[PDB]
Design a binder for this molecule. Structure first.
Ligand code: NA
Ligand code: NA
Lengths: 352, 352
């Protein structure tokens, strides 16, 4: 064991070459997911507060080219920002997001084999999953999960944030809300949300305050979280997790995140609020951190000469490229306040 | 007492109008100080790693115009970056900084009445104050104080950081090193350093690691500090100060800072390292924080519609403008990596 400590999580940052095709306009606040060797991309924001399109873009990692998936079936009726998309088996699932006119996307699947959309659930109905934007999503073998986000405004309410998870059982075609973690747990948008070794992790994100003593900043108490909780479906219990380390990341939201084995791997994110909400970029991070969910220790990671610049509001997912599992980062906004079309992959080398 | 908490330190950010005159080129890593209604400016960096000039620029707050002070006497022989300047009585004191060729500025005064420079001390001599760059400075009635910074490289050493304070007794014309705070105290450059209600405060800054277990980032263990110490000249004792608050600022260096009554007031700063040291801007903050040195509580402050953008490596000082004490911020680098000529003043309204 050398005197000087080398970093534990080792890997390489790579910029993914995009050769061409029907390439998506730059975007933030969108959803991506991978099935096999293909990345799917839906939704997005650019310019600020404006949605863009409702095409389903497909990037092939072997050919490094983009195409547009056939727009068959129940094509999603709204072009949205603040949306998310996950993959389970050969289907993609899109939930929520909204446009500037406050119309929210309902719940749809896309069958990548038959190449068709299916409308699955109308949101915001009595006893069903609510309309949400800037929520987070993850999935496992038989569920799509939605955490947090911001609600739809109505006559007698302004939008608020959620602290709940809605779970869609794919085989049964049924939604259920998971146990509510209660008042000590922050309602948040753009939080980290992942299945890791069978359990659900909710971490960091952009929180509603539950304390009138927290002073406002730019007229709102809203702040960046650094808290971490775990839900075990096997027992249906919530626990708050104390995480440690000299390099524990400062409070942040809107970051790339993925699970690789025991690691939660993040990159970028909003570390300071913009004075004008989402109009400007606030302050965005250029750093990557990983949490060992077994030891509960955070450490930064580095990936060689390729260093992605400051960014947040990216789409992210886990995939495997050239036999390496890792964190895929696509799009987002930069400190120039421009959207980017850049795609980066942190390829993990060490054991997980 | 209302249910919802208003901010304690209240004030107004103002952009100081600069009408014209012999206006200084944009710069970071320079020194400013005020005597009466005049701001003095010396040194600076632009482009990265390059010094600029050795003029003493003078801004009159009543006329809002710049001039160049007569270059009489022992004009400082080197154009430097990483320099600092303080005012005591009607004299300015310039210490250190270096140029790209690793020549360091010695210790000079400028007499604002007689309008002449005097060479006071050759640095880096046996038993005397060392050559330093990226040190911090403050002063009181009869002393100029230098804290931290980076040393001059020689044959058998690379530059290192200091954890000591050198104190120049103006009346006696003599330097002395203050008690060394020891190994648990971080050697730092670009740290906060102020006299507050008679005591010396050292806070945050850019630290050398004293633990081979801290992993390197971009090839160096160097990291941003969040520690706070106080030295009382009356007893000659050091104490580490535990500061608190939900809005305690994340680790940072290279920030604007000033003392107003019981408050240490800061703005901006490097919150993430650049991959290439000082070549790029790293990640810079757009937030202001204040520490009540009596209660030891940190809180953010806000100043109305004028919100200075992300910046660090600014020059800063305390002054009074239109009967309001506050924090003066001049120059620095922006997240575009450009230097700025902008000048901002946070005018304090509440009791201190
Ligand atoms: Na394939
Ligand atoms: Na005057």
């Amino acid at each position: 064991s050398p005197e000087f400590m080398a970093r534990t999580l080792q890997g390489e940052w790579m910029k993914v070459e995009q050769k061409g095709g029907q390439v998506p306009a730059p975007r933030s606040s969108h959803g991506i997911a991978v099935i096999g060797d293909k990345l799917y991309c839906f939704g997005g924001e650019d310019p600020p507060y404006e949605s863009i399109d409702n095409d389903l873009y497909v990037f092939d990692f072997n050919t490094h080219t983009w195409s547009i998936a056939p727009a068959n079936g129940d094509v999603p009726k709204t072009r949205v920002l603040g949306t998310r998309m996950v993959a389970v088996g050969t289907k993609l699932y899109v939930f929520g997001g909204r446009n500037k006119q406050l119309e929210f996307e309902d719940f749809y699947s896309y069958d990548t084999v038959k190449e068709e959309w299916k409308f699955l659930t109308k949101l915001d109905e009595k006893g069903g999953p609510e309309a949400r934007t800037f929520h987070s999503m993850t999935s496992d073998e038989n569920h799509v999960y939605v955490f947090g986000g911001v609600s739809k405004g109505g006559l007698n309410a302004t939008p608020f944030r959620f602290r709940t998870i809605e779970a869609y059982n794919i085989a049964e075609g049924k939604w259920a809300q998971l146990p509510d973690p209660g008042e000590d747990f922050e309602k948040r948008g753009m939080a980290g949300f992942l299945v890791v070794q069978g359990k659900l992790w909710v971490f960091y994100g952009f929180a509603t305050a539950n304390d009138p003593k927290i002073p406002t900043l730019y007229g709102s108490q809203d702040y960046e979280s650094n808290r971490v909780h775990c839900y075990d479906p096997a027992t249906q219990k919530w626990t708050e997790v104390e995480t440690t380390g000299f390099e524990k990341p400062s409070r942040r939201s809107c970051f790339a995140h993925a699970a690789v084995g025991k690691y939660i791997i993040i990159f970028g994110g909003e570390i300071e609020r913009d004075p004008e909400a989402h109009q400007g970029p606030g302050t965005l991070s250029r750093e990557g951190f990983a949490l060992d969910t077994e030891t509960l220790v955070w450490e930064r990671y580095e990936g060689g000469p390729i260093k992605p610049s400051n960014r947040g509001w990216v789409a992210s997912t886990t995939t495997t490229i050239n036999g390496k599992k890792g964190l895929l980062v696509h799009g987002g906004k930069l400190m120039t306040n421009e959207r980017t079309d850049e795609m980066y992959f942190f390829a993990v080398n060490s054991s997980t």
